[PDB]
Design an enzyme around this catalytic site. Structure first.
Site, PDB file in Angstrom:
ATOM      1  N   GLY A 214      12.221  -3.265  -0.211  1.00 63.33           N
ATOM      2  CA  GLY A 214      12.781  -1.957  -0.475  1.00 63.33           C
ATOM      3  C   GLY A 214      12.363  -1.462  -1.850  1.00 63.33           C
ATOM      4  O   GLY A 214      11.335  -1.876  -2.381  1.00 63.33           O
TER       5      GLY A 214
ATOM      6  N   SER B 155       8.915  -9.073   0.064  1.00 68.72           N
ATOM      7  CA  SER B 155       8.854  -8.137  -1.069  1.00 68.72           C
ATOM      8  C   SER B 155      10.063  -8.401  -1.966  1.00 68.72           C
ATOM      9  O   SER B 155      10.265  -9.555  -2.374  1.00 68.72           O
ATOM     10  CB  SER B 155       8.723  -6.715  -0.526  1.00 68.72           C
ATOM     11  OG  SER B 155       8.768  -5.756  -1.570  1.00 68.72           O
ATOM     12  N   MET B 156      10.879  -7.391  -2.291  1.00 69.00           N
ATOM     13  CA  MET B 156      12.017  -7.596  -3.184  1.00 69.00           C
ATOM     14  C   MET B 156      13.014  -8.605  -2.627  1.00 69.00           C
ATOM     15  O   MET B 156      13.748  -9.239  -3.397  1.00 69.00           O
ATOM     16  CB  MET B 156      12.705  -6.260  -3.471  1.00 69.00           C
ATOM     17  CG  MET B 156      11.817  -5.255  -4.193  1.00 69.00           C
ATOM     18  SD  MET B 156      11.101  -5.922  -5.714  1.00 69.00           S
ATOM     19  CE  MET B 156      12.545  -6.018  -6.774  1.00 69.00           C
TER      20      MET B 156
ATOM     21  N   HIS C 285       4.019 -10.918  -1.304  1.00 72.72           N
ATOM     22  CA  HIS C 285       3.193  -9.721  -1.282  1.00 72.72           C
ATOM     23  C   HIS C 285       4.062  -8.473  -1.186  1.00 72.72           C
ATOM     24  O   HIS C 285       5.107  -8.472  -0.529  1.00 72.72           O
ATOM     25  CB  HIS C 285       2.223  -9.791  -0.101  1.00 72.72           C
ATOM     26  CG  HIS C 285       1.410  -8.549   0.104  1.00 72.72           C
ATOM     27  ND1 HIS C 285       0.312  -8.239  -0.672  1.00 72.72           N
ATOM     28  CD2 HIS C 285       1.519  -7.553   1.017  1.00 72.72           C
ATOM     29  CE1 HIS C 285      -0.213  -7.102  -0.253  1.00 72.72           C
ATOM     30  NE2 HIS C 285       0.499  -6.666   0.770  1.00 72.72           N
TER      31      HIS C 285
ATOM     32  N   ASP D  85      -1.979 -10.747   1.779  1.00 73.63           N
ATOM     33  CA  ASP D  85      -1.036 -10.116   2.700  1.00 73.63           C
ATOM     34  C   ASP D  85      -0.704 -11.137   3.782  1.00 73.63           C
ATOM     35  O   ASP D  85      -1.300 -11.170   4.864  1.00 73.63           O
ATOM     36  CB  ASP D  85      -1.619  -8.834   3.287  1.00 73.63           C
ATOM     37  CG  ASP D  85      -0.633  -8.096   4.161  1.00 73.63           C
ATOM     38  OD1 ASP D  85       0.579  -8.399   4.084  1.00 73.63           O
ATOM     39  OD2 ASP D  85      -1.069  -7.216   4.930  1.00 73.63           O
TER      40      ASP D  85
END
Ligand code: 7SR
Ligand code: 7SR
Ligand code: 7SR
Ligand code: 7SR
Ligand code: 7SR
Ligand code: 7SR
Ligand code: 7SR
Ligand code: 7SR
Ligand code: 7SR
Ligand code: MG
Ligand code: MG
Ligand code: MG
Ligand code: MG
Ligand code: MG
Ligand code: MG
Ligand code: MG
Ligand code: MG
Ligand code: MG
Lengths: 178, 180, 178, 176, 170, 170, 170, 171, 171
Positions: H58, H87-88, H112, H149
């Site tokens: 996010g 991610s976060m 990533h 990725d």
């Protein structure tokens, strides 16, 4: 909206707006955006190429539009060497009235029932710089002081053709041709 | 889908769309809502027809519920500006700015077919809206030759007129069932 | 918008923009995307084939657009050997000002009331690689240092044509032809 | 957008005139519709030549894999030299077409961006990915492990890095 | 999400504070009028605080609130916070004399952004109401309302729209 | 979907913590103002904590909150968590001196992403307020606000926007 | 957001005041009728206050309210604040004689902005109802309703639509 | 949209000091999580707090708001990755108290990452430092891994330093 | 409109140690199901939990999040397929404790399944192993069967290894 075809060496068929362009008449109708400006500028350059001395007629019925696009038309009007007759029919508001006032002196026209407005309905300083540019241009062509322009533009009103002539926006109010 | 018709122009045949062919008969159509686009098109045709002759009449076919006032006024001013006699023809209806254009025809040449409906009632700052209303009062008074008090009073009524009622009021001159 | 048709004596008739191309004038108007870039690139290749030595006029009235599409136009301007006169009318912001500055030195023009902006309104490293590509290109054509460019591009403001001429983005501000 | 007309006297739209210069545009996202147009043009240009090269203008962010492969197979199928020209960017299937040009005839302008990273059931998706691995390996002359590893990173390369990597042969600032 | 203490706005009502917030329509007027009648029933002599941060709105809805302010017997404190433009500034000026307030950075506008005769009849009604509460002449009001501008709280006090500009409570 | 303990935001209000989250509009300003008036009624001496995670918002709504912060008699601790940009950073800097806080990874922006003269008057109001609370000159504020960039919490502490960057409580 | 005292509209009904707000449709008619039946049950003789600010609405829904007003035996005071147009003015005029009120700045319109014979039958029903409560002749009603205009409260009192124009309570 | 009552099931789950970091993280999610963290700290600032993480990522500043609050409070924080933490989400997972970072066996972890240019890069370096601090890796290993990725298995994330334990059943 | 019963009927169902996994499974559905599983385990780590399954499938990581939690908790879990259990729904059905996986007679079950490529395949293989483990079929029987786009009857699924009992009525 279907565009009618007219017939004008021999016989050539145009769409009525293209035929209007052959009479050295350029239309500034409706809201002014980058697209309208480019089309108007293209027509002005074309008409100057066919003669840099025969007058150009600018038909103005516009509520205004994007400032930089209006200024693009303004600068091109000053740049070309032709005399430019502006004709306010219906209305000329915001940038529309600026273009009207930008015609060659003595050749700025309005029909009797038109309405003219110089009131105007990106960062802050940046919006104010464009406002000052409009103040200068109006002052230049109306021959009024900046104080009168700034004060008048603050009023949310339209002018009749006669008061716009007295203010310096246009030169002639014609009911019929002279 | 707009039909195409052929006319012979002298050295050969030209194909027009039927509306462009109507323009060759010096007839201009004012149909449906009037906006800046309609006004520019009508004005262009009026200037074109005057160039081809500033003395042969121009026929204005009106079937419109009205529209933008400044656009209507642009057509009105152009009708007065050109030197031609203008025959106005109300077919279907002429309401609001439509009836103003109808009444603005050359005197004696303002026509309606029998079942048309005519309305002078009208369905931005406040003072400015009133200035436009006063411009409309003056134009109607000018061409119907009624007093401003009668125009202001009549326009306050939300009603249509028959062609015979519009003729007595001064909006039009003749109600024709067949050509004369 | 309906596009008018003009007639040239050869008697040929074109749309006004196609006629503008015959005067070696290419339009960069509105937002720049892949579609605009391909059209401009096609015109540049065509004009060079008709003569690799007659100047090309590039009309610029754009708020910017996609960077890679702008860079596609930039690279093609450098690639062809013609001298390219750039003309800022209305505005040249973001990628628009990059194309304006990329004209042949001495042939970069603006009309008096134009607005020019070099500020700019994919992974993180990749976004920064494009920014540095823009720093280099601006530095090359304005002949300013990277530190002057990076600092100036950080400011969310427009320049007047005269201010763009001292910064090195353009060479001449013309009110009428000389 | 209004497309201009140019005269060579015959008059065509500028894109049709570009086709006459043996230039085919692969422009924007690639779908079945784009592939068909490109394939049709490629078959047309090969008939009309005594093996004169075909120029493929590539400014694309990628698109549908099968449509890209349709263009790729047709490039190999016609037996003509194909110059690929990367202008703006060639990402995903766009970079595959760029690398699929005739050796020695793969070009990029200086500021282009090239990406081989790629932004139906699972096995079926994975089969297409290996098909992409094989095609890249063949034309870049890199090992499959270098391709798999490089495609795993979400990054663009400069034209000179694409020339070292084997995707293109020449980075031109002006014509030579 | 509106916090609970009552809901925070209902608790504000128990402190005799009525909010005129955002665009004024028939719905807002009905809510404000309902609140005014209720606070008057609990006491027709304790002051009512009217918190105003509004860009304006429908004239008849604004006039409905105005007439109710005139009708009830309570003293009404008007508080301009943020802005009071168009009908909002009319409600601000309609407070009990001496009890019309603004905070320092507020903006006040009397300019105003149905048939033609009817719209102007409403305009003159606004002219008279402004003239009545600012103690200015009808030509001063008509001229000032034609200017598309905001005034500072100090400038609105000098014009007669409000009485006190407070940085802290008195 | 909010959890209840009250709802968690209402219970946060009972700890004298008011949240300014997301874009600031007339609705957010009114709720924040209502909360500020409520907590000072319960005490005019106990500090009030203002949690700020906002990208900015409407200028007059932000100024409404600002004026209310100055108006009330309480000391106000401002806490920047996440980000405080545009009007958010103005509220952050408007806390009581010595009690303007940020957590280590927050981002602060004073750059700011109706007629012309009026937009410029509001801009000058922002210049004055920033100059007053950062104790910087008007040309330093005007110049800094023209830059489209964020500041680190330590850089904002040196600019005068906040007083303390805390990693854990002291 | 509707404030709680429970809700202010429910509390106002305990004061025997029913709101007729906004466009009148079948939903509003059913709600008003429900309230009228309720207020009659708690007392068949105490007056009921009908607060009207409406631009009009569906004819049959307006007539449903009208028929219910006459059906119940209570005296009903009608109060025009803001505006009463189309069916709104019919309800206003339908109050018990001597108990039809307007505040000073209200606007009243009797002009009215299914097969053809049906629309004309409803039109005469409106003519009759106006005529009965206006104590005017039907030609005066048809003629006045054809005019697209509003009346002032004093002009509506004189026409027979309302009885008193009050600025404050008497 | 339909939520069972036992109090709300999430509100009751909050009473055992478990806070949910669920779905995409925005300013709204961050504020609720921060509110919950401050509340549970007041109730006992020494009993552990359980952070349930199933998020695709996010907004960075919102995630960093949660991160800073995790470090700020004085409680030990157990992070639990079930489903995914990308991610976060993986940053919050790694930010748990050392030794108390958990994942269930079939979870997927991604570091990533799928506003002006300089600012985007400034936030990226902030993420590099935070990952480096809690994974105990070099900036080059973090920068190098984040460019890829791909997802990690729980065992691969334990080896990378993002988590401490992969549990099939409780101990 | 959700009826309330001498609280709301779904809350009463939970008190009956019955958890519903109904409709498409996403991250939101998964965390509520996980919340319910953890709650009922606290009320008893030995009384069975009933899992009502009428789902066409959904997000893989969300389904695996529930799967991992089913294995993690110590309770016996009865799975009940009524209507259908397709895609991730059928895996949750098969993940019940052996001997306690149920279907009503007219249910339909599908193990066929209707982000980068390699990772999509990693999740697919994780599904292969989880099915194989609970079906006690070989990976090729799972891989081959999942390739057919078809449903099984409850009887057809029992023999396969997905479920244990098809009941018209209780025993
Ligand atoms: C007053 C123009 C000058 C004379 C001069 C010049 O400054 N520019 C520059 C120019 C470029 C683009 C947009 C501009 C807008 C504002 C001002 C300048 C512009 C080009 C122009 N040119 C021309 O006007 N060619 C005739 C023609 C035009 C259009 C069509 Br359709 C058909 C024929 C080509 C030959 C030439 O010297 N100039
Ligand atoms: C009755 C018009 C006068 C005669 C006169 C004049 O005032 N204006 C000015 C003008 C400009 C624009 C819009 C206007 C609208 C209302 C009135 C005036 C307008 C131009 C017109 N012109 C013409 O009418 N040319 C013939 C023609 C027109 C259209 C087409 Br399609 C084909 C041919 C060009 C030659 C000329 O003197 N006038
Ligand atoms: C400056 C061009 C060179 C001279 C050279 C070259 O690099 N490419 C490659 C090329 C392809 C596509 C897009 C490119 C964009 C940027 C640079 C290169 C591009 C083709 C070009 N060609 C030409 O320009 N033909 C004349 C013509 C073009 C368009 C039209 Br419409 C009408 C006529 C064919 C003959 C030839 O050698 N070149
Ligand atoms: C290199 C092509 C071969 C030589 C050969 C061949 O395999 N196919 C087969 C074919 C069919 C359909 C789609 C295909 C797509 C990919 C490849 C093959 C396709 C047709 C092609 N043909 C041709 O290219 N005709 C010239 C022409 C093409 C387009 C236009 Br527009 C104008 C002129 C017809 C004459 C001919 O022998 N072949
Ligand atoms: C100013 C009050 C006067 C005394 C008087 C009067 O003119 N109207 C008329 C009225 C009706 C509807 C809307 C109106 C809007 C504007 C002005 C008048 C309105 C009603 C009022 N009444 C009251 O105010 N009851 C107390 C109360 C009200 C609301 C709530 Br919630 C709780 C308690 C009931 C008894 C009574 O005589 N009057
Ligand atoms: C710091 C305020 C003063 C103390 C003072 C004052 O200037 N105004 C005026 C006022 C009105 C509306 C919005 C305003 C916004 C900004 C400033 C002023 C406002 C009302 C306030 N009042 C109060 O704050 N009551 C306590 C309370 C408030 C909200 C809630 Br929920 C619960 C309890 C009621 C009694 C009183 O004297 N004042
Ligand atoms: C004879 C008059 C009375 C009105 C009478 C009557 O005609 N109908 C019939 C009726 C039904 C529906 C809508 C109607 C609309 C217009 C007229 C009649 C309606 C029912 C009403 N009833 C009542 O008024 N009960 C008291 C009460 C009402 C509402 C609420 Br909330 C709370 C309490 C029930 C008992 C009773 O005899 N009558
Ligand atoms: C020293 C330890 C505490 C972190 C300390 C502190 O630094 N701040 C500052 C603060 C303010 C706003 C948002 C922040 C977000 C991140 C970090 C700090 C924030 C407030 C906190 N307070 C509390 O935690 N009250 C208990 C409680 C909270 C929420 C709920 Br729901 C229920 C109960 C109130 C009293 C107090 O001293 N502190
Ligand atoms: C040893 C067995 C337990 C699973 C154990 C544990 O591993 N975690 C970790 C955990 C956190 C978040 C989501 C997880 C999802 C899957 C697995 C683990 C999760 C928390 C749990 N706790 C509990 O289950 N409290 C009972 C209860 C919960 C919710 C409700 Br509503 C009512 C009652 C609090 C105390 C405790 O030791 N454990
Ligand atoms: Mg000139
Ligand atoms: Mg005439
Ligand atoms: Mg060059
Ligand atoms: Mg080849
Ligand atoms: Mg009073
Ligand atoms: Mg203070
Ligand atoms: Mg009665
Ligand atoms: Mg900690
Ligand atoms: Mg188990």
């Amino acid at each position: 909206p279907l565009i009618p075809i007219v017939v004008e060496r021999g016989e050539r068929a145009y769409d009525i707006y293209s035929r209007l362009l052959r009479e050295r008449i350029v239309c500034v109708m409706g809201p002014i955006d980058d697209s309208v400006a480019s089309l108007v500028i293209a027509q002005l350059l074309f008409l100057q190429s066919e003669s840099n001395k025969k007058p150009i007629h600018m038909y103005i019925n516009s509520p205004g539009g994007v400032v930089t696009a209006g200024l693009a038309i303004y600068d091109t009007m000053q740049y070309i060497l032709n005399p430019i007759c502006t004709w306010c029919v219906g209305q000329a508001a915001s940038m529309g009235s600026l273009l009207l006032a930008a015609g060659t002196p003595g050749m700025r026209h309005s029909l009797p029932n038109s309405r003219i407005m110089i009131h105007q309905p990106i960062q802050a300083e940046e919006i104010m710089k464009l406002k000052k540019q409009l103040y200068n241009i109006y002052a230049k062509h109306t021959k009024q002081s900046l104080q009168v322009i700034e004060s008048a533009m603050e009023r949310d009103r339209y002018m009749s053709p006669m008061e716009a002539q007295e203010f310096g926006i246009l030169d002639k109010v014609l009911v019929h041709p002279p």
